[PDB]
Amino acid sequence: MASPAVRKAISDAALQYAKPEGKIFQYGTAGFRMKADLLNTVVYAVGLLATLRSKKLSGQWIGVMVTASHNPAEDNGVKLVDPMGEMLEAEWEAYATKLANAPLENIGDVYDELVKEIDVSMENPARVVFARDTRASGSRLIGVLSAALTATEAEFIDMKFMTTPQLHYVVRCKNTLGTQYEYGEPTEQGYYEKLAAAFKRVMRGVKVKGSLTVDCANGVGGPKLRELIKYLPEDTGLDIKIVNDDVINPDSLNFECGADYVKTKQRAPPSSKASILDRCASLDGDADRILYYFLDEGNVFRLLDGDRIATLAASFIGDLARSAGIAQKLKIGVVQTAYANGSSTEYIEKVLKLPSVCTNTGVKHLHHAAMRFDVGVYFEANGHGTITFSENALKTIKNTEPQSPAQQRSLECLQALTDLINQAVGDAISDMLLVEAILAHKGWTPKEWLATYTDLPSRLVRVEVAERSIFKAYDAERKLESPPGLQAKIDSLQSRYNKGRSFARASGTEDAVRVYAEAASRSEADDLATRVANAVRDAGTVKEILQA
Ligand SMILES: [Mg+2]
Prior knowledge:
Layout: H1 4-14, E1 32-35, H2 40-56, E2 61-66, E3 75-81, H3 93-100, H4 107-117, E4 127-132, H5 138-151, E5 155-161, H6 164-176, H7 188-202, E6 212-215, H8 221-231, E7 240-243, H9 259-265, E8 279-283, E9 290-295, E10 301-304, H10 306-323, E11 332-336, H11 342-351, E12 356-358, H12 363-370, E13 375-379, E14 385-389, H13 391-399, H14 405-420, H15 428-442, H16 446-450, E15 458-464, E16 472-474, E17 479-482, H17 486-495, E18 501-506, E19 512-518, H18 522-539
Parallel strand pairs: 2-4, 4-5, 6-7, 6-8, 11-12, 11-13
Antiparallel strand pairs: 1-3, 2-3, 8-9, 9-10, 13-14, 15-19, 16-17, 18-19
Helix pairs in contact: 1-4, 1-5, 2-3, 2-4, 2-5, 7-8, 7-14, 10-14, 10-15, 17-18
The structure holds magnesium ion (MG).
Function: Catalyzes the conversion of GlcNAc-6-P into GlcNAc-1-P during the synthesis of uridine diphosphate/UDP-GlcNAc, which is a biosynthetic precursor of chitin and also supplies the amino sugars for N-linked oligosaccharides of glycoproteins.
InterPro entries: A-D-PHexomutase_a/b/a-I, A-D-PHexomutase_a/b/a-I/II/III, A-D-PHexomutase_C, A-D-PHexomutase_C_sf, A-D-PHexomutase_CS, AMG1_II, AMG1_III, PAGM
Keywords: Carbohydrate metabolism, Cell wall biogenesis/degradation, Isomerase, Magnesium, Metal-binding, Phosphoprotein
């Protein structure tokens, strides 16, 4: 219910900036994200929101990450991170949005509106940690953020340049020190030591073969990976070659590299100098996504995307849980979207003998569902993912008495994985260490990993429609309620093709629907995708009103 000097300082500091034309803002997944010259007042609003989130939650540290991830050099973005390093509570997105869309002259009053609607205790100082990627606009935007935090009399720490996962790491640590489940030392240094020490344990008595060439998107992941390498152990046989670390030139960020580029264009970066069979990976620009790839013997680009990594991780955890003797005690499952290749799902259920849960798209539904297992593996094709360990999981690992040196070795190994794998957020660097460790333990070349199952040919298409809003989905977005008859037709179309599977869903932003289709052969997959694409387009063109 306070205060006068704060209201004044808020509206005064706001008067430094101006709202772009008639821009309407929305805090989506990953927050606000757009052209960097539209972003001053938006980041201001988030500085203000952050103050309120911290105070509502007893002065716990709340994080802000300034990044636009995959996006080109001239975008930026801003998102809040909650106390345990988790993504901002779904219902607080709407507050961010209310603040962003306010006229500036009124922003001090909308702040008051919120301290009353949210019911915040003003005893506590707000505490916020922030960091940014390598973008040119970062410095200016950090100044905007800092003017907001100052007007609110928050305590803040500028953690400088970090990957997104490092900023989730810090937040969680700061809020867990003194606790029973201390996540680590809340510094970049502590992040490195924790990864190093865990990698070391997982790697006991085994060796990585051949080098790893890591495309770092010319992003913050590049210098952080290099810094991490200084902390890693010596006789693991890890040999990381860093490429695309041109962080000094903002124009280079995500320019024809790394992860998003490789995944969506399904080819290596054009600048790549890797040879035949060289094991490779691409990080995205804020290093929360990764994928693997290689040129095979005949010189063909071979992608190993998020789903590939998911089945790799699930195979490894499954084998370890069994030999640790806890596989019957613990619920272990893979969480996927409907975008997952059918062959990947088949491998999990038939060969790994583990549940798969199809859930709605968006890390939120994926994480929430992975937390229903004791050991929940989720990746998206795009390279975002992690493994979640429940308290039960940690406890039964920590407490079970082993009946053999193999059983003990597996339990130790499993314990280490728990500290290696980022629990707050999908972490490209952590995931990298994971994949390398697993390949070492299995003795697998990239080609043996690819050979594990064969993807059904698939095709994704973007279908423009009149109104995105008439396409209403359910059952992990695999079925349409609306418009009438479309599902019946999708059902019939997929039946005509060997192992034929297709589904269409709205994008949620555009006036477009996405069609996914897969089948036994290329021509089938393409034809099915086109047929569903035409039906979608047909049901999505304005009906047309008759006369007399
Ligand atoms: Mg990212």
